């Protein structure tokens, strides 16, 4: 009858979190003993056993598109890119007018393939003035350059061996620090104390909505955020079924997110080797120009195994039957930015743009076997670019250095971000074509399972117990109220595992060989997250001490619970609320309960007793 | 500055073995019951902190842009927490 | 004298500058000193948490 | 110019106090230095950032 309020802590609670993530990687990334290949900062190496504890008979919502993970991810990536850009020498004096020659003393100029690229060989050899190490001393020296790096100055009649950099007139340019490469590493993003990751192991579960097969995790699976447009490389496959998602299926403008079931090889290759020439321009500033290449300069081409691509497309178009039986159309990108016009990526630092040539040459509308029969080893052209404006950051550009040696490039396929044409009929037929504008789409594609989650150990409940008056990370709770009292020791211990994260930092100044300062938003905000978590725990312990509940988690209350609550049995409260529906019912009155337990429990405390005692 | 520590001689002795800051203008007995009004907000820096929303940026995009202001604010938080920590440690002692 | 690092901190007087004038002048030294303060505090904080447990 | 070696003779307008004649300019259209350049450096004021009070 008597509804004595009772407070509990360390109780499993899961809510929407908005906090800072922490970079990490496997031990192999740090044992490479290189300063940094493109993630290997002094980030905390992964725990020897990040616990992934299952949890059944639960429910949780998901909105993968509204997740704040990719925001901080690309922010920290751009910060690390700027940090690696800092030690690079600048290329501002290179902007002088030059004189180049297209036809050179090499054998091949027209390869076997012709796709409007043989004449556009993008191979010229060019002379250029460069200042010597001394101030007044200069000298003209020659090297090899592509056509995409510059453009013929149209101020005169024609080119006439007169060119200008495309990015110089817009902004500055600096080298890409060739000792740093641009290869991917599995990146695991860990959460602070009081926060965790929630993964949904259901395969049919789409990117949003409710899920039940919960897995609580400390650090995400190692992601490889490969820069890839119109395609995903080395990403997780949708096992058991091809996953198709979108922000708004009714809206054609939204990207069509895809995650495939299998992978296929892509042999994109520049067979002819590359060279390097370190010409000193200034007092310790040297440019590593692309020297004279040895051998016949074969046109950098690419090849794709269309046999397995036919099976992949068969499974996809089997999956593309959203609200139809037989109707689909495939098209190419008619035009736009170069990232969207062609499948863009980087392979070792050189920005490899291997074409989406044979993508639109397919239509699985009536007979799927009609597209499975023509097993076509798709040979195609693949171009290379030396400069790029990352994330529309038109500032100090980055020059891709030589990659010396014959260039092979293999890359899995796991997802094609298609886009529906708005300039077409609605129900007569559906058109899809590749689009690679937003890079964040490819990054959130692998995060539809993982979602950051907050831990709120606070708990209240009415029971018949009362004190004397004066005068298993987060699991094993799908429907329980009594089981939480048993796990008050394990969950409290796991609630404050941040010291284990801080122990393995190894952030004295540097990890592998040598670094600059390189202390930026990542580390300082990690320390800020530590400070704020410690402050949250401090305020919690302060509220415990105010109520006298700092000695134990179980803490009674002097004031009985009011009758404003809707009638309900204690057994029904204990059996079928999992501690969460009850907190949903006392959402607004929780502040009143706090005020009551803070004021009446303290001010109504008498001083002593004198009548009877052992004396 | 605020020094919440206060002392006074009275007859009360423990057993031996063998409204931000107002609501007391001039009081000592009535001020001996309004203590929690100051203690609840003494360690409530998270209230002022929750409204920051400095994830990276606010409007489109910014550079690193973390300078004497933010780091001094963090240091002020740390030292204000250390003061009350030493206080509570002395209380437990 | 266990958690009495505030005695060492009180004499710092790093308001912005000390002697004549300076630039921003806050680098690995000061920030890692603050990190060491925070970690030394956090160690005994978790210890006292285990005590309360 | 945007190119390195290219130079162009372009014209603008300057205040009367921001510069001072040089080279013993008794009576002629002699050159003019900046009042603060020989003392210290100078850079643009980042026009997107306004200097109004809040
Ligand atoms: C650094 O230098 C480069 C190269 O000069 C600039 O990049 C672009 O340069 C072109 C040429 O000056 C700019 O103009 C474009 O012209 C296209 C057609 O070219 C003919 O017509 C122009 C006169 O308009 C002649 O000068 C030229 O010789 C040719 O005879 C147009 O098709 C362009 O506009 C249309 O197409 C684009 C692309 O499809 C669409 O996006 C537009 O909406 C429009 O439909 C354009 O007018 C071009 O503007 C320059 N680019 C940019 C972004 O401005 C760099 O601009 C320069 N750096 C800086 C900072 O200016
Ligand atoms: C990537 O590959 C696609 C597919 O090949 C290219 O798009 C377009 O491909 C068609 C192929 O028929 C080109 O049309 C043909 O052009 C030749 C040469 O002018 C002509 O003789 C044929 O009769 C036919 O018209 C079309 O030109 C081409 N589009 C463009 C803009 O050139 C795409 O160009 C390729 N992209 C890259 C970067 O390689
Ligand atoms: C997806 O993952 C695979 C495997 O991790 C990547 O394969 C990589 O392929 C490149 C060539 O295509 C290999 O390059 C070689 O690296 C060695 C390193 O010493 C170097 O000596 C050689 O001269 C050559 O450059 C690379 O080793 C290989 N494996 C890696 C990086 O682990 C593949 O590149 C990934 N996909 C994408 C899109 O990056
Ligand atoms: C660039 O300046 C030169 C030199 O002129 C002097 O310097 C200027 C900055 C300005 O202060 C003038 O009043 C000075 O007299 C200009 O003169 C010609 O420069 C070219 C290239 O060196 C040379 O071949 C000519 O003989 C010079 N002619 C004269 C009469 O001095 C030059 O014109 C300026 N640039 C442009 C694009 O006009
Ligand atoms: C996308 O495919 C279309 C074919 O449907 C290509 O269209 C041709 O474009 C060239 C331009 O080089 C024209 O000369 C042809 O007349 C066009 N033919 C047709 C039938 O439209 C288009 O070029 C392709 N674009 C890309 C970027 O691949
Ligand atoms: C407990 O709940 C009851 C009913 O919900 C509250 O009764 C209120 O009493 C005042 C008179 O003091 C009336 O003006 C209100 O209209 C009553 N409430 C309702 C909903 O009619 C009672 O105040 C509550 N007590 C506490 C301590 O919360
Ligand atoms: C706590 O108070 C909020 C304040 O409105 C309540 O929110 C409303 O809840 C009703 C149904 O419970 C909804 O129909 C309204 O739309 C909600 N308001 C808004 C603005 O959306 C909430 O329900 C209260 N919760 C409890 C347990 O009493
Ligand atoms: C090109 O190579 C072929 C053999 O592959 C050879 O017969 C021919 O003479 C070569 N031409 C030049 C210009 O080197
Ligand atoms: C080369 O061009 C011709 C006509 O321009 C075309 O028929 C042929 O398909 C092209 N080669 C390749 C490999 O596409
Ligand atoms: C192109 O050449 C012709 C003939 O030499 C000339 O008249 C014309 O001015 C030139 N175009 C330019 C300078 O833009
Ligand atoms: C639910 O997650 C657990 C994690 O241990 C896994 O073993 C199980 O197969 C998952 N079930 C489904 C239906 O995804
Ligand atoms: C995802 O699935 C849910 C049902 O589980 C559905 O309501 C929702 O519309 C789906 N998402 C999209 C984008 O259609
Ligand atoms: C590419 O796909 C194969 C399976 O087809 C897989 O074994 C391999 O690990 C993938 N490559 C990655 C993840 O880099
Ligand atoms: C390919 O996808 C289909 C449906 O999308 C799925 O049934 C099949 O198992 C997948 N293939 C695998 C996992 O090898
Ligand atoms: C999706 O877009 C259609 C129109 O394109 C709109 O009517 C509908 O409300 C949208 N649904 C959602 C969930 O945004
Ligand atoms: C090229 O394709 C075949 C498999 O289809 C094989 O030689 C190899 O796996 C591929 N090599 C790459 C993509 O570098
Ligand atoms: C096909 O791919 C292979 C594997 O890299 C390559 O050697 C060949 O040149 C490609 N092109 C063909 C067979 O036309
Ligand atoms: C879709 O149409 C094909 C005919 O190409 C048919 O074989 C298949 O059974 C149909 N599937 C449906 C209606 O689910
Ligand atoms: C697919 O494209 C081909 C030409 O590439 C065309 O002949 C065919 O009609 C198209 N089929 C559909 C269903 O769009
Ligand atoms: C597939 O081809 C068969 C004949 O081979 C035809 O009868 C059938 O209608 C075609 N499928 C569709 C969906 O039209
Ligand atoms: C393509 O390969 C398949 C093997 O699955 C074979 O049955 C078919 O006849 C081949 N088609 C052609 C045109 O070679
Ligand atoms: C030229 O190519 C060969 C491949 O046969 C390679 O061994 C050599 O290192 C290359 N030359 C360079 C990188 O100077
Ligand atoms: C598409 O919708 C129109 C009316 O909006 C209807 O007349 C037509 O029959 C529909 N298409 C099919 C294949 O039924
Ligand atoms: C899930 O396990 C059993 C069987 O479904 C169920 O009775 C229980 O309430 C659920 N929650 C748990 C085990 O935490
Ligand atoms: C509460 O849950 C148990 C086990 O899941 C079930 O047997 C019982 O019927 C439920 N009672 C309700 C929903 O009132
Ligand atoms: C302040 O002092 C006056 C005079 O002793 C007294 O009347 C008043 O109640 C005091 N408290 C206030 C103003 O809060
Ligand atoms: C710098 O120029 C100004 C203006 O004439 C004047 O102070 C003086 O001439 C120069 N300064 C010195 C220290 O000579």
Nearest-10 crossing angle of helices A521-546, A69-85: 140
User: Which residue's structure tokens are 């619970």?
Assistant: A561
Query: Angle at the Cα of A142 (from A136 to A144), degrees rounded to 5?
Result: 140
DSSP-assigned states of every residue in chain B: ----------S--PPP----S-S-SS-SSGGGT-THHHHHHHT-HHHHHHT---SS-SSS-------HHHHHHHHHHHHHHHHHHHHHHHHH-
Q: Which residues does chain B have within 8 Å of residue C24's beta carbon, measured at their own beta carbons?
A: 67-68
Cβ atoms of A364 and A314 closer than 8 Å? yes
Distance, in angstroms, between A536 CA and closest chain B CA? Answer: 7
d(CA A83, CA A523) in angstroms, rounded, equals 13
Structure determined via: cryo-EM
Cβ atoms of A393 and A170 closer than 8 Å? no
Q: Cβ–Cβ of A550/C52 closer than 8 Å?
A: yes
Query: Angle at the Cα of A304 (from A301 to A305), degrees rounded to 5?
Result: 150
Half-sphere exposure for A39 (CA within 13 Å, toward CB): 27
Q: Which residues does chain D have within 8 Å of residue A95's beta carbon, measured at their own beta carbons?
A: 2-4
Other Cβ atoms within 10 Å of A24 Cβ, number: 24
Does the beta carbon of A590 lie inside 6 Å of ligand 19? no
User: Which residue's structure tokens are 């059944």?
Assistant: A56
Q: Which of A396, A542, A551 to mutate to test the interface with B (most CBs of B within 10 A)?
A: A542
φ, ψ dihedrals at A18, nearest 5°: -140, 95
Q: Cβ–Cβ of A96/D2 closer than 8 Å?
A: no
Q: Which helix (H) or strand (E) holds A261?
A: none
Other Cβ atoms within 10 Å of A415 Cβ, number: 25
Q: Which helix (H) or strand (E) holds A283?
A: none
Other Cβ atoms within 10 Å of A12 Cβ, number: 26
Nearest to A82 by CA among A567, A517, A608: A517
User: Which residue in the set A502, A519, A524 is minimally distant from C39, CB to CB?
Assistant: A502
B65 CB near a chain C CB, below 8 Å? no
Cα distances from A62 to residues A175, A202, A601, in angstroms, run: 42, 12, 41
Cβ atoms of A176 and A401 closer than 8 Å? yes
Which ligand has the minimum distance to the alpha carbon of residue A376?
Answer: 21
φ, ψ dihedrals at A481, nearest 5°: -125, -30
Distance (Å) from CA A340 to ligand 19 centroid: 23
Chains that touch D (3 or more CB pairs under 8 A): A
C11 CB near a chain A CB, below 8 Å? no
B73 CB near a chain A CB, below 8 Å? no
Cβ atoms of A225 and A184 closer than 8 Å? yes
Strand ranges for A306-458 from DSSP E: 329-330, 351-354, 377-385, 387-388, 397-399, 407-409, 418-420, 431-434, 451-454
Other Cβ atoms within 10 Å of B53 Cβ, number: 7
User: Which residue in the set C16, C24, C38 is minimally distant from B78, CB to CB?
Assistant: C38
DSSP-assigned states of every residue in C1-32: --S-THHHHHT---SS-SSS-------HHHHH
Structure tokens given for A559: 């004031």
Structure tokens given for A425: 């009929």
Nearest to A78 by CA among A20, A38, A30: A38
Task: Kindly tell me the sign of the dihedral angle through the C-alpha atoms of A554, A559, A564, A566.
Answer: positive
Does the beta carbon of A155 lie inside 6 Å of ligand 10? no
What is the maximum alpha-carbon separation in chain B?
71
Strand ranges for A146-274 from DSSP E: 150-152, 163-165, 173-175, 195-200, 208-211, 214-217, 243-246, 255-259, 266-270
Other Cβ atoms within 10 Å of D13 Cβ, number: 4
What's CA A540's distance to the chain center, in Å?
33
Q: Which helix (H) or strand (E) holds A8?
A: strand A4-8
d(CA D17, CA C53) in angstroms, rounded, equals 74
Strand ranges for A13-170 from DSSP E: 15-16, 52-55, 60-63, 99-101, 124-131, 138-145, 150-152, 163-165
Helix (H, G, I), strand (E, B) or coil at D30: coil
Question: A138-145 and A124-131: which strand pairing?
Answer: antiparallel
User: Which residue's structure tokens are 């002088």?
Assistant: A96
φ, ψ dihedrals at A53, nearest 5°: -90, 125
Cα distances from A593 to residues A457, A589, B57, in angstroms, run: 16, 6, 37
Query: Angle at the Cα of A460 (from A456 to A461), degrees rounded to 5?
Result: 140
Half-sphere exposure for C36 (CA within 13 Å, toward CB): 11
Between chain A and chain B, the number of residue pairs with CB atoms below 8 A apart is: 51
Cβ atoms of A541 and C51 closer than 8 Å? no
Chains that touch A (3 or more CB pairs under 8 A): B, C, D
Cβ atoms of A381 and A117 closer than 8 Å? yes
Which ligand has the minimum distance to the alpha carbon of residue A106?
Answer: 8
DSSP class of residue A391 equals G
C26 CB near a chain A CB, below 8 Å? no
DSSP-assigned states of every residue in A542-579: HHHHHTTTTS-S-B--SSBPPS-SPP--HHHHHHSSTT
d(CA A352, CA A343) in angstroms, rounded, equals 9
Other Cβ atoms within 10 Å of A606 Cβ, number: 8
């Amino acid at each position: 009858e008597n509804l004595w309020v009772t407070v509990y802590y360390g109780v499993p609670v899961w809510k929407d979190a908005e906090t800072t993530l922490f970079c990490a990687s496997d031990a192999k990334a740090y044992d490479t003993e290189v300063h940094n290949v493109w993630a290997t900062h002094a980030c905390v190496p992964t725990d020897p056993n990040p616990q992934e504890i299952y949890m059944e008979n639960v429910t949780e919502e998901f909105n993968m598109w509204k997740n704040n993970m990719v925001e901080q991810m690309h922010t920290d990536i751009i910060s690390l890119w700027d940090q690696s850009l800092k030690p690079c020498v600048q290329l501002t004096p290179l902007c002088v007018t030059l004189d180049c020659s297209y036809n050179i003393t090499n054998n091949i100029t027209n390869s076997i393939t012709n796709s409007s690229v043989n004449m556009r060989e993008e191979i010229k050899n060019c002379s250029f003035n460069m200042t010597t190490e001394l101030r007044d001393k200069n000298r003209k020296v020659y090297s090899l350059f592509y056509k995409l790096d510059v453009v013929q100055i149209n101020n005169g009649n024609n080119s006439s061996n007169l060119y200008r950099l495309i990015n110089c007139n817009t902004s500055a340019l600096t080298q890409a620090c060739p000792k740093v490469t641009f290869e991917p590493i599995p990146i695991r993003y860990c959460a602070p104390a009081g926060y965790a990751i929630l993964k949904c192991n259901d395969k049919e579960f789409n990117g949003t909505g409710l899920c039940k097969n919960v897995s609580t995790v400390q650090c995400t699976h190692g992601i490889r955020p490969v820069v890839s447009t119109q395609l995903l490389l080395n990403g997780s496959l949708a096992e058991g079924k091809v996953m198709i998602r979108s922000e708004n299926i009714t809206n054609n403008v939204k990207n069509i997110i895809v995650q495939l079931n299998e992978t296929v090889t892509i042999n994109c290759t520049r067979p002819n080797n590359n060279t390097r020439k370190s010409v000193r321009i200034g007092p310790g500033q040297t440019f590593y120009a692309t020297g004279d290449i040895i051998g016949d300069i074969r046109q950098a081409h690419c090849n794709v195994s269309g046999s397995q691509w036919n099976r992949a497309l068969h499974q996809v178009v089997g999956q593309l039957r959203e609200y139809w039986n037989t109707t689909i159309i495939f098209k190419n990108s008619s035009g736009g930015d170069l990232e969207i016009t062609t499948h863009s990526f980087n392979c070792g630092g050189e920005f490899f743009y291997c074409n989406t040539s044979g993508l639109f040459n397919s239509n699985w509308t009536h007979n799927d076997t009609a597209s499975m029969k023509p097993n076509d080893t798709i040979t195609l052209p693949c171009r290379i670019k030396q400069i790029i404006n990352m994330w529309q950051r038109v500032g100090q550009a980055i020059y891709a250095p030589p990659i010396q040696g014959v260039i092979r490039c293999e890359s899995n396929i796991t997802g094609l971000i298609l886009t529906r044409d708005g300039g077409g009929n609605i129900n007569e037929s559906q058109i899809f074509r590749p689009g690679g504008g937003d890079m964040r789409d490819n990054w959130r594609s692998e995060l539809y399972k993982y979602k950051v989650v907050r831990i709120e150990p606070l708990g209240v409940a009415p029971t018949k117990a009362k004190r004397r008056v004066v005068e298993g990370f987060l699991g094993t709770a799908g429907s329980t109220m009594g089981a939480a009292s048993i796990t008050l020791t394990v969950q409290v211990r796991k609630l404050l595992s941040g010291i284990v994260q801080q122990q393995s930092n190894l952030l004295r100044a540097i990890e592998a060989q040598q670094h600059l300062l390189k202390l930026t938003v990542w580390g300082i905000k990690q320390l800020q997250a530590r400070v704020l978590a410690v402050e949250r725990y401090l305020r919690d312990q302060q509220l415990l001490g105010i109520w006298g509940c700092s000695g134990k988690l179980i803490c009674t209350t002097n004031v009985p619970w009011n009758s404003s609550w809707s009638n309900k049995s204690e057994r029904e409260i204990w059996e079928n609320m999992t501690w969460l529906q009850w907190d949903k019912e006392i959402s607004n009155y929780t502040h009143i309960i706090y005020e009551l337990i803070e004021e009446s429990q303290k001010q109504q405390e008498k001083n002593e007793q004198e009548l009877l005692e052992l004396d």
